[PDB]
Amino acid sequence: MTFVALYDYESRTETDLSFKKGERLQIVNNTEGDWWLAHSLTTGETGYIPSNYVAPS
Amino acid sequence: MTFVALYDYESRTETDLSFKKGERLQIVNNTEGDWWLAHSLTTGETGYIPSNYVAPS
DSSP: OEEEESSOBOOOSSSBOOBOTTOEEEEOOOTTOOEEEEEETTTOOEEEEEGGGEEEO | OEEEESSOBOOOSSSBOOBOTTOEEEEOOOTTOOEEEEEETTTOOEEEEEGGGEEEO
16 A cells, blocks of 8 residues: 655656655556566567566466 | 567657567566556655565555
8 A cells, every 4th residue: 555665766767756765655556557677589679568568478 | 487468569768668469578687676656645746666665654
């Protein structure tokens, strides 16, 4: 439900949240799912993906 | 381990991976953890956060 930031984090893109240690955060439900860092065996490209867009082999 | 893309996805930032339905993807281990959409109760701002930076209340 509710979480506390353990460290400062500075945003690197337009979509991430900057926060300071000690902030209280609540998880937002959304249709994309959690995001995972992934490597495409098909294209060789690498980056974050929305987990609801994929399924186990 | 290995996953298959169920849908096309077009990148929206410099860090996400674009992929087509059918691509084979493998999860990359990294120090940040999975990313979650979160709302800061402290600042009112909202965006994605690295899960390894937070802990349950």
